[PDB]
């Protein structure tokens, strides 16, 4: 037994607007004591990331680089979502004495590995959430004293970021699904995100021991008009300019999932040209979805003398038979005009016919946009809505930002608006950027909720389920958890 | 300004027949309706690949107007958004066609739709583009701007907006009532004697 | 402390080593033994430049033998004599000991005057004839210079301060002094479809590598790591021989071999210390029998080579019999003993410890466990101390000049504290080098270099952070 | 016959916006060449002031081209940049050169050269007579650069150095050098102070400068096992292909340029030693996952909000003080 294992899976999903989305996912498990000093020999788990867990006491780390914005209202709900720019949140171990020093050192170390400007994380853009961003792995106690979070909304994701990312994979772009990752195709898209997640998980079914899991993910969306404008179907060759020829020799599971469910008709499926190995039916995000499975380890599918090119017929469905809009989506904008005063507004939609559900809202604002909290208003259907929980942290000039956290119950079939006034500040002449007439950015806001489900889901075992079904722990079979991000805002100063 | 002075653009537009046919179909529908054809505009806007939205507005005038023959005015505005593929929704440019009740500017609408169909298939946009058609000549524009910035400057009533595209940087209005032209005329003066930046006029003259 | 720093630029270093010479009964002539207790002194100088001067001295005391020493030295092998006579086992580094036996002795093969062993001890054969006490002195200084100090030992250090000559370049090849070092072992598997390579590092490190580094740890601290890299390739394509049915890498292609792998080696280092890399390469099946060739063109026995200040590489051929299994991949296991033999030889050669050079008609002891003798380690310590002192002096002079030149740079209290610490450490280390206490001098020189370089590279010594003194009149005139 | 054992390179672009595509293209071409000839990515410190490969204005994302035929992409599949758009400044460049860097800076972003290292430095941007501009706010003068190189020489942090600048009036930047073993090349002399402007139609901008274009064309034929000297780069881009005149200063340098290979500064050729020696060696409670969004616990984690009221002692003190004052003036 090697004591460590690797799995890889690609999922392809047509979208209600006529676009096509793809997600790559690589996962490794290791039965080792990484939390304590002493491990010196590495095989499948990368050495660059493996020695950070002990040097800086880390329980969980999450890092993402993204361009674009996910259009929930027109694309549907995603498996995973990230804000524009770069975000980083970390859970530390309770033995850590000074969290700020370790947080600064860790950000500086990560900036070297991932070729990003993470050294710009400081006290003016770091918060400590009190009810959001709970652990995603095995946890005993949750004291938010040990959690940090930050976002840089103007960071750029280009090939220079993808080169280190591909360097940490074991087959390293020379075998398996990794041969499809070509930069020019990957950036000719409407959405692009790269992510890394580290957390501890159960070692076996009884779950009395710990194992450490690393997960690397990449997701893109291909637009219909710009890409694949012609009547030719969505094949692998036209999306990635490459076909699949052979499996990674180090992986124990390697497969491609194609979503072939048709909402309008009954027991009718989309057409996939190569006959698949198997079909898989399950409840995903509160809906019964059907997938076609191509098993790359089968020698019926892929051999030395014949490779794989999958083809899929999909066009934007007629106005009738289109899927209904999701039960939750949101928007954000700036009100007013001039260079003195303004307002920040958020709109929250509940499109469910008869059920009301609560949401948790987290907002962070820079110190230069001074906020007046006696002007905060929340209105649903023309009546005032009183939040159950509210936490406010005021800003200090050049020291810390604003933080606002609310818990609001949303009435059914309605839209709710949240607003607050601000005033702009005049800075010193040395505190502006090289291009001072462009403006400043307010980071995107976070929304978390438990959305009701159409169908009830059965309990699932993480070692026998697809990788896209085991990202969030499930507490009840009648709801599911979502975390949404709005868009960033651009504001000018005198 | 070196951002525009040091660059060059190679045009490749070719949609004349489509613009003509759009204009002919728009004029007939407006004849039948007696006002702005809204369903046709929405369907046609969706066919070329935009996100479409509408807005209703109304107001009461201080006294009856002889020049335009209005006392109490109600109408609807239709606008469509093109989202920049490789960016977020932070900045936007506006192209608008103001329609009156005098059966004019059909060719402007046709050209607008053809230009949207040409623009939809590119990758190099760094800003969103809004394509706007208003109901009454300058009351619709005022209603749309007031609803967009969420300010009640005049007292006009409206339905709330559902789609926005960030901060607006520049705008261009087009008026055209013939298939051919002999010249193009430009206007710069605005309300209360305010003026735009001279660089916009220099650009227009550079493309002339 | 500007005046003391101005004094440090011209430094006199005098390295003294204590040697204890014992004359056994009836070795020196009886009349010669009348004046046996007395001290002799051998001093020499190394010509240098830049106003710094060094000299080296041997301090020999000719005490007569204690009787118990005779029972031990009397008869048997040299090993038994060393075992019995090593009873005191006191703490002394840079110190030697020499015994003088009869010209008819049967413990020294009767064909040779000297026996060099490990553990800082040697054996020499005297003259019963009373020609003089000079030949004894020549023989003793010959043995002492084979061990201990030589002008070649201090050539990698002192390299700048010594006149350049032909063959200067290769005398600069060894590693430079540092507090710590990183060692990483990597296994390269370019064809995972054909070969399933498993190795046992943890046992190999524990059994063989750790005692070696424990012996070598007198110079600095050491770290050990390991990893496996898949689909990692070489930067040259081997030539095929139809007659041999094998593949070759020629001597001209070797300088370009390790280029691609360095793209995957870098960016995993955990510190700012110098890093050393040792690579084991299992060739692809397409060129499975791979051999490295010398300048003449004959295959080399170790099948490996190393590069100065970087590390080494070894190619590992799979047995043809192990290829017999129809199932592909084929499980292959590496023999760790030979791999560590080659790698430890390379590591010992990278620090600059060459094979001992023997005086004529001498005999060297058998190889020890962990592969290192003690006098070699003491030699390394001497060189390290000299290099550290030179570097600290140069850094302090440069810092003083820089602060003298520019006037608007701020001097904080931490910087001054570090400067005082450095000057005191330099003086103490020089004194203890003169007194002959090598370990304390080494520690003090380490502290000196650390403090001086901590002061020199402070982020606040950047001239760009301060308002120019030229433009101040513009500011004070308007309200004055 | 060189006597070095490792190679380093620092390549810097000091421009901004999208219409300054040319400087970034030049830097990318140099990076491609030095990688192809052997220098590892951990020994190259690359500083780029703006991103042109994934700029949303780019008609071809993730590509940067040198000629309008679009047959060579200089950004490439494999690239790593150490300093991003907002960390490129005069101050950081000087810190990197002098070693006076903040303590928490990682290894990949510092230059760890020694006595046995050859270094190549290349710069490009908008400059004048005796200065080079960083973005638009600041500038670096020739005196400061000449001082930094002497700081590097006094600590023995290089063996030989090669400096190349591609700017208008670029010869002014190597006039004050006074340290041993430095060779310098420039694209234009002090008088020559205009710049060309021929924008490319499909992309929309001016692609690349002439001198670096011909220098990159002469580095595309050179291979790892080349015997070309440094006397052949002194005859590249004669005034006839360029319209300005290239210069060189080689009086601080000790070796003859006819004996200096190109790969001594543009590649990595190792010194190899066969090893012929060897060292003899003897042969019960289950664990659970956290709950996302627990509503009741969140509601009860904070005490309820009561309205604020002034403390009673403050009221008593106020009124006692006031009446004590009143009883003086009245009684
Ligand atoms: C809270 C505020 C603190 C107030 C302190 C409480 C004491 C109130 C005093 C009452 C006013 C008062 O004394 O009127 C009469 C005053 C003082 O007497 P007098 O005849 O001048 O004798 C001393 C001379 N020789 O005669 C004068 O010196 C005339 C000036 C009157 C002073 C103002 C009256 C105080 C009332 C408060 C008004 C303040 C506005 C708010
Ligand atoms: C702008 O303000 C005016 C008031 O000046 C609002 O007008 C009122 O609208 C309500 C609801 O539509 C009517 O019932 C009232 O009769 C209107 N009052 C007057 C005095 O006309 C108008 O609704 C506001 N517009 C927006 C978009 O908020
Ligand atoms: C794959 O290759 C094998 C061996 O040549 C062959 O038998 C098989 O038919 C090929 N693929 C198919 C068509 O199943
Ligand atoms: C080497 O490590 C030991 C163990 O912690 C430490 O005491 C010593 O100071 C270290 N030596 C150096 C030179 O860092
Ligand atoms: Ca680098």
**For chain A, what is the HEC assignment?**
CCCEEEEEEEEEEECCCCCEEEEEEEEEEECCCCCCCCCCEECCCCHHHHCHHHHCCEEEEEEEEEECCCCHHHHCCCCCCCCCEEEEEEEECCCCCCHHHHHHHHHHHHHHHHCCCHHHCCHHHEECCCCCCCCCCECCCCCHHHEEEEEECCCCCCHHHHHHHHHCCCCCCCCHHHHHCCHHHHCCCCEEEEEEEEEEEECCCCCCCEEEEEEEEEEEEECCCCCCCCCCCEEHHHHHCCCECCCCCCCCEEEEEEECECCCCCCCECCECCCCCEEEEEECCCCEEEEEEEECCCCCCCECCECECCEECCCCCCCCCCCCCCCEEEEEEEECCCCCEEEEEEEEEECCCCCCEEEEEEEEECCCCEEEEEEEEEEECCEECCCCEEEEECCECCCECEEEEEEEEECCCEEEEEEEEEECCCCCCCCCCCCCCCCEEECCCEEEEEEECCCCCCCCCCCCCCHHHCCCCCCCCCEEEEEEECCCEEECCC
The answer to whether B121 contacts A189, with C-beta atoms less than 8 Å apart, is no
Nearest ligand, CA B146: 2
Number of domains within chain D? 1
* Cα D38 to ligand 5 centroid, rounded to whole Å: 14
Helix (H/G/I), strand (E/B), else coil: C303: coil
Residue D107: closest C-alpha in chain A: A112
Select from B2, B9, B84 the Cβ nearest to the Cβ of D56. B84
| C-beta separation of D109 from D170 below 8 A | no
B87 CB near a chain D CB, below 8 Å? yes
Is D67 one of the catalytic residues?
no
Whether C271 is in the pocket of ligand 4, judged by its Cβ within 6 Å, is no
- C329 and A171 within 8 Å at the Cβ level: the answer is no
Residue to mutate (ligand 2; options B153, B157, B160, B162; most atoms within 8 A of CB) = B157
- Rounded CA Rg of chain D: 31
Give the integer Cα–Cα distance in Å for A40 and C225. 5
Chain D touched by C406 (CB under 8 Å): no
Whole domain around residue D128: which residue ranges? 8-259
Whether D284 is in a domain gets the answer no
D98 in any annotated domain: yes
Q: After which residues is chain B broken (C to N over 2.5 A)?
A: none
How far does CA B39 lie from the centroid of its chain?
A: 17
* DSSP sequence for D196-232: -----TTT-S----HHHHHHHHHSSS--TT---BSSS
Q: Whose CA is nearest to atom 13 of ligand 4?
A: C179
How much distance in Å is there from the Cα of C209 to the middle of ligand 4? 19
In a domain, D301, yes or no: no
Q: Which residues pair with C275 in a beta bridge?
A: C182
Which residues of A touch chain C, with CB atoms under 8 Å apart?
A: 40-43, 47-48, 51, 55, 112-113, 164, 167, 170-172, 174-175, 249-250
- For chain C, the first-to-last Cα distance in angstroms comes to 38
Q: Report the length, in residues, of chain C.
A: 480
Nearest CA in chain B to D17: B3
Pick from A85, A307, A319: nearest CA to D85 = A85
Question: Looking at beta carbons, which residues of chain B come within 8 Å of A488?
Answer: 88, 90
Establish if B2 touches chain D: CB-CB under 8 angstroms: yes
Q: B159-178: string of b/e by CB count within 10 Å (b at 16+)? A: eebebbbbbbeebeeeebee
* Residue in chain A nearest D42 by alpha carbon: A112
**Listed resolution, Å:** 2.5
- Nearest chain A residue to C225 by CA distance is A40
Is D100 within a domain?
Answer: yes
For residue D79, give the ligand nearest its CA: 5
Q: Which residues contact B89 (CB under 8 A, 6 or more apart)?
A: A69, A487, B83, B128, B164, B165, B166
The partner residue sitting opposite D57, judged by closest CB among B2, B10, B126, is B126
For ligand 4, the distance from its centroid to the CA atom of residue C222, given in whole angstroms, is 10
Please indicate, yes or no, if residue D324 is contained in any of the structural domains. no
Chain B residues in contact with D197 by the CB 8 A cut-off are 6
Active site residue D126: yes
Backbone φ and ψ for C189, nearest 5 degrees, come out as: -125, 90
CB contact under 8 A, D293 and A450: yes
Q: How far is the CA of A489 from the centre of ligand 1 (A)?
A: 57
- Nearest CB among A139, A388, A449 relative to D299 is that of A388
Residue D288 contacts A, CB cutoff 8 Å: yes
Domain-embedded: residue D331: no
Touch between B and A (at least 3 CB pairs under 8 Å)? yes
**What was the structure determination method?**
cryo-EM
A68–B149 C-beta distance less than 8 A:
no
Q: Which chains touch C (3 or more CB pairs under 8 A)?
A: A, D
Question: What residue has token string 């402390």?
Answer: C1
Q: Partners of B172 in the beta sheet?
A: B95
Q: How far is C193 from chain A (nearest CA, A)?
A: 6
Q: Token pair for residue D206?
A: 């001016």
Distance CA A82, CA A70 (A): 9
Question: D318: helix, coil or strand?
Answer: helix
**Lookup result for tokens 């020493």:** C69
Q: What residues of B are in contact with residue A190 (Cβ under 8 Å)?
A: 85-86
Q: Separation of C221 CA from ligand 4 center, angstroms?
A: 6
- Signed CA dihedral, B184, B190, B195, B199: sign only: negative
User: Is residue D248 one of the residues assigned to a domain?
Assistant: yes
Is there a contact between D281 and C160 if contact means CB atoms under 8 Å apart?
no
Asked, for residue D273, whether it belongs to a domain, the answer is no
Binding site residue list of A? 437
Count of C-beta atoms within a 10 Å radius of residue C64: 15
Distance between CA atoms of residues B32 and D163, nearest Å:
76
């Amino acid at each position: 037994p090697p004591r460590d294992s690797l799995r890889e899976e690609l999922v392809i999903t047509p979208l209600p607007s006529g676009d096509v989305a793809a997600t790559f996912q690589f996962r490794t498990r290791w039965d080792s004591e990484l939390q304590r000093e002493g491990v010196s020999h590495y095989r499948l788990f990368p050495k660059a990331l493996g020695q950070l867990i002990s040097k800086y006491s880390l329980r969980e780390l999450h890092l993402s680089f993204t361009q674009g914005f996910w259009r929930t209202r027109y694309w549907g709900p995603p498996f995973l979502q990230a804000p524009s720019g770069a975000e980083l949140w970390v859970w530390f171990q309770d033995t850590v004495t000074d969290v700020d020093k370790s947080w600064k050192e860790l950000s500086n170390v990560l900036s070297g590995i991932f070729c990003a400007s993470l050294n710009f994380i400081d006290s003016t853009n770091t918060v400590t959430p009190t009810a959001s961003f709970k652990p995603l792995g095995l946890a005993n106690d949750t004291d938010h004293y040990f959690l940090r979070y930050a976002v840089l909304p103007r960071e750029v994701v280009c090939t220079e970021n993808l080169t280190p990312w591909k360097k940490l994979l074991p087959c390293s772009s020379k075998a398996g699904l990794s041969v499809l990752l070509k930069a020019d195709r990957l950036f000719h898209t409407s959405y692009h995100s790269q992510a890394v997640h580290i957390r501890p998980v159960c070692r076996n079914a009884r779950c009395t021991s710990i194992s450490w899991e690393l997960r690397q993910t990449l997701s893109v969306v291909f637009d219909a008009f710009i890409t694949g404008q012609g009547k030719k179907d969505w094949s692998l060759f036209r999306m990635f300019s490459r076909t699949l020829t052979e499996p990674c020799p180090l992986a124990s599971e390697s497969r491609v999932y194609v979503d072939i469910t048709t909402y309008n008709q009954d027991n009718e499926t989309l057409e996939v040209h190569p006959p698949p190995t198997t079909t898989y039916q399950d409840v995903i995000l509160g809906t019964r979805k059907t997938y076609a499975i191509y098993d790359l380890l089968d020698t019926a599918m892929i051999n030395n003398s014949r490779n794989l090119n999958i083809q899929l017929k999909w066009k934007r469905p007629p106005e009738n038979e289109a899927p209904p809009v999701p039960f939750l989506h949101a928007q954000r904008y700036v009100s007013g005009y001039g260079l003195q005063k303004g307002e920040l507004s958020t709109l929250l939609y509940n499109t469910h016919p008869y059920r009301a559900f609560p949401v948790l809202l987290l907002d962070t604002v820079p110190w230069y946009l001074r906020l007046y909290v006696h002007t905060l208003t929340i209105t649903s259907k023309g009546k005032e809505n009183k939040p159950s929980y509210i936490h406010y942290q005021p800003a200090q000039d050049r020291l810390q930002p604003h933080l606002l956290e609310m818990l609001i119950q949303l009435p059914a079939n309605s839209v709710t608006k949240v607003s607050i006034q601000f005033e702009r500040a005049l800075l010193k002449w040395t505190e502006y950027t090289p291009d001072p007439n462009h403006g400043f950015y307010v980071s995107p806001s976070v929304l978390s909720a438990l959305v009701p489900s159409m169908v009830a889901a059965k309990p699932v075992d993480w070692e026998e389920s697809p990788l896209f079904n085991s990202l969030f722990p499930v507490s009840d079979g009648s709801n599911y958890f979502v975390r949404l991000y709005t868009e960033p805002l651009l504001v000018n100063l005198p | 300004e070196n951002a525009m002075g040091s660059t060059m653009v190679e045009e490749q537009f070719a949609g004349g027949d489509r613009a003509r046919a759009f204009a002919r179909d728009f004029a007939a529908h407006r004849k039948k309706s007696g006002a702005l054809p809204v369903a046709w505009l929405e369907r046609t806007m969706r066919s070329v690949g935009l996100e479409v939205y509408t807005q209703s507005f109304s107001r009461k005038l201080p006294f009856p107007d002889e020049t335009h023959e209005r006392y109490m005015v109600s109408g609807t505005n239709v606008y469509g958004i093109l989202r920049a593929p490789r960016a977020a929704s932070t900045e936007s440019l506006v192209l608008t066609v103001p329609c009156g009740s005098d059966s004019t500017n059909s060719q402007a609408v046709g050209l607008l739709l053809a230009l949207a169909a040409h623009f939809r298939g590119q990758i190099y946009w760094a800003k969103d583009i809004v394509f706007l058609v208003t109901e009454h000549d300058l009351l619709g524009t005022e209603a749309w701007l007031e609803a967009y910035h969420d300010v009640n400057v005049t007292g006009m009533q409206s339905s709330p907006l559902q789609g926005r595209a960030g901060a607006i940087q520049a705008a261009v209005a087009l008026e055209l009532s013939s298939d051919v032209v002999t010249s193009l005329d430009v206007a710069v003066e605005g309300l209360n004697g305010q003026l735009p930046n001279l660089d916009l006029l220099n650009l227009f003259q550079t493309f002339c | 402390p500007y005046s003391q720093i101005s004094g440090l630029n011209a430094l006199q270093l005098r390295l003294m080593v204590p040697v204890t010479v014992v004359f056994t009964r009836e070795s020196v002539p009886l009349d010669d033994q009348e004046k046996l207790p007395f001290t002799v002194v051998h001093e020499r100088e190394i010509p240098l430049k830049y106003k710094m001067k060094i000299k080296c001295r041997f301090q020999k005391a000719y005490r007569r033998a204690l009787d118990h020493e005779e029972e031990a030295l009397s008869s048997g092998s040299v090993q038994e004599a060393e075992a019995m006579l090593d009873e005191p086992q006191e703490q002394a580094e840079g110190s030697l000991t020499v015994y003088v036996i009869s010209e008819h002795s049967s413990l020294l093969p009767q064909d040779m005057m000297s026996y060099i062993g490990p553990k800082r001890t040697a054996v020499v054969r005297g003259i019963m004839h009373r020609e003089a006490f000079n030949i004894i002195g020549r023989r003793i200084v010959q043995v002492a210079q084979a061990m201990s100090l030589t002008e070649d030992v201090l050539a990698a250090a002192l390299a700048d301060h010594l006149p350049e000559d032909k063959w200067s370049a290769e005398k600069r090849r060894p590693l430079k002094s540092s507090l710590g070092y990183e060692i990483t072992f990597s296994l390269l598997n370019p064809d995972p479809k054909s070969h399933d390579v498993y190795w046992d590092i943890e046992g190999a490190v524990r059994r063989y590598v750790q005692p070696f580094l424990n012996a070598l740890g007198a110079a600095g601290n050491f770290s050990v790591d390991s990893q496996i890299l898949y689909y990692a390739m070489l930067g040259v394509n081997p030539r095929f021989d139809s007659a041999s049915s094998s593949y070759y890498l020629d001597m001209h292609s070797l300088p370009h071999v390790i280029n691609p792998v360095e793209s995957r080696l870098g960016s995993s280092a955990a510190s700012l210390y110098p890093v050393l890399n040792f690579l084991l390469y299992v060739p692809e099946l397409a060129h499975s029998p791979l051999y490295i060739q010398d300048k003449d063109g004959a295959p080399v026995a170790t099948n490996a080579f190393h590069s100065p200040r970087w590390g080494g590489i070894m190619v590992y051929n799979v047995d043809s019999k192990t290829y017999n299994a129809s199932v592909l991949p084929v499980r292959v296991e590496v023999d760790m003993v030979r791999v560590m033999e080659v790698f430890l030889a390379q590591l010992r050669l990278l620090f600059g410890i060459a094979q001992p050079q023997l005086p004529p008609k001498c005999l060297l002891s058998g190889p020890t466990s962990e592969g290192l003798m003690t006098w070699e380690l003491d030699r390394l310590l001497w060189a390290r101390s000299v290099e550290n002192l030179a570097t600290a002096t140069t850094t302090l002079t440069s810092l003083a000049q820089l602060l003298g030149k520019i006037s608007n740079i701020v001097i904080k209290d931490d910087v001054a504290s570090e400067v005082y610490k450095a000057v005191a450490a330099v003086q103490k280390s020089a004194e203890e080098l003169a007194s002959g206490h090598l370990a304390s001098a080494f520690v003090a020189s380490q502290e000196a270099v650390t403090s001086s370089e901590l002061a020199f590279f402070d982020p606040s010594l950047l001239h760009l952070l301060y308002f120019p003194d030229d433009q101040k009149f513009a500011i004070y005139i308007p309200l004055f | 016959r060189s006597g070095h054992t490792n190679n380093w390179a620092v390549l810097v672009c000091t421009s901004r916006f999208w219409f300054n595509y040319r400087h970034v293209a030049n830097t990318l071409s140099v990076y491609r060449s030095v990688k192809r000839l052997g220098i590892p990515d951990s020994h190259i410190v690359l500083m780029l002031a703006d991103d042109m490969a994934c700029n949303p204005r780019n008609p071809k994302p993730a590509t940067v081209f040198s000629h309008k035929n679009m047959e060579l992409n200089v950004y490439g599949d494999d690239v790593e940049v150490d300093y991003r758009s907002y960390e490129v400044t005069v101050e950081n460049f000087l810190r990197v050169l002098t070693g006076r860097i903040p303590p928490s800076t990682p290894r990949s972003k510092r230059l760890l050269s020694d006595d046995r290292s050859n270094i190549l430095i290349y710069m490009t941007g908008h400059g004048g007579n005796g200065f080079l501009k960083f973005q638009d706010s600041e500038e670096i003068t020739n005196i400061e650069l000449a001082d930094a190189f002497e700081q590097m020489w006094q600590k023995r942090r290089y063996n030989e150095l090669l400096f190349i600048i591609d700017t208008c009036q670029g010869a002014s930047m190597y006039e004050r050098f006074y340290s041993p073993n430095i060779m310098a090349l420039a694209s234009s002399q002090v008088g020559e102070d205009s710049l060309s402007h021929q924008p490319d139609p499909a992309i929309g901008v001016h692609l690349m400068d002439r001198y670096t274009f011909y220098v990159l064309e002469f580095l595309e034929e050179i291979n790892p096992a080349s015997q070309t000297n440094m006397n052949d780069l002194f005859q590249v881009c004669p005034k006839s292909l360029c319209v300005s005149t290239p210069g060189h200063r080689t009086d601080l340098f000790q070796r003859d340029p006819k004996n200096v290979l190109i790969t001594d500064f543009f590649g990595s050729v190792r010194k190899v030693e066969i090893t012929t020696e060897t060292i003899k060696l003897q042969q019960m409670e289950p664990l659970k996952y956290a709950e996302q969004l627990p509503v009741a616990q969140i509601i009860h984690q904070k005490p309820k909000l009561k309205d604020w009221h002034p403390p009673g002692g403050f009221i008593l003190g106020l009124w006692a003080l006031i009446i004590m004052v009143f009883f003086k003036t009245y009684g």
